[PDB]
């Protein structure tokens with residue numbers, strides 16, 4: 001089997017992407033934020049505290065003839081940005097782009113933090129990291145991809161995120177028309193439960209490539225690209241007027257600037273992030289200070305190849321017995 005679904009930016013900055021997902025019988029379609037950085041599929045629901053729902057579409061398990069309460073199971077997740085949600089668990093049929101999984105754990109939110117309430121466009125998250133990170137207790141549950149894997153034509157999914165445009169998540173096949181050149185594969189460590197790999201270096205604009213190992217994760221749930229302070233300082237030093245602002249929370253730059261590209265290495269291959277992709281717009285409405293899309297990881301503990309980086313590539317998440325990541329230009 002295969003599946004293919006369009007993913008759409010939630011706003012004009014590509015802050016996140018939503019993909020329609022069919023849950024239950026008859027189908028309830030919710031727009032979920034496919035997340036390479038977590039292993040829980042959770043949804044706003046008829047159980048979510050009413051004051052914490054503000055425009056999201058909810059899953060109502062009592063209206064699904066295939067929903068079953070997973071007795072005793074609870075979940076609670078705290079994400080790297082300080083957001084959180086928790087609740088109980090149903091199993092139900094979940095379909096993405098024509099690919100159907102029966103008995104998928106659907107984690108129903110009883111509580112969500114303010115940033116989840118304030119995003120009316122995101123009805124939940126569909127985790128695509130390794131199932132070892134799933135938070136369901138006392139019996140950890142499998143991700144949608146893990147459940148679908150055996151049925152797929154090939155045990156892979158691909159992320160083709162658009163710049164200010166829709167893109168595609170495919171399951172079970174590699175669309176050879178969706179990228180240019182060849183796909184370069186690189187080793188993955190699953191020891192932390194993430195799609196963790198090592199970039200071979202970077203360049204700023206037309207500058208020379210610096211060969212240096214940069215360990216990080218391929219996280220489509222992070223908006224930005226978080227890299228070591230040395231790398232980030234070298235990037236922003238090429239933008240007149242750019243500075244790190246403690247009050248704003250990162251590097252900012254004059255909105256009148258033209259940003260240089262940023263290149264990252266994948267083995268001997270190179271992925272070029274155009275400068276435009278690094279512009280996240282005014283820090284507040286009407287400001288001439290703009291927020292940068294490349295930021296320091298120094299306070300995180302891990303480097304993060306988020307949407308800024310991934311949207312410049314066609315990315316293969318290869319879930320073979322020894323997982324690997326593939327990157328192609330497009």
Ligand SMILES: Nc1ncccc1CO
Nearest residue numbers: 035037079080081221222
């Ligand atoms: N990947 C993620 N998923 C959900 C919330 C936050 C992040 C990243 O900070």
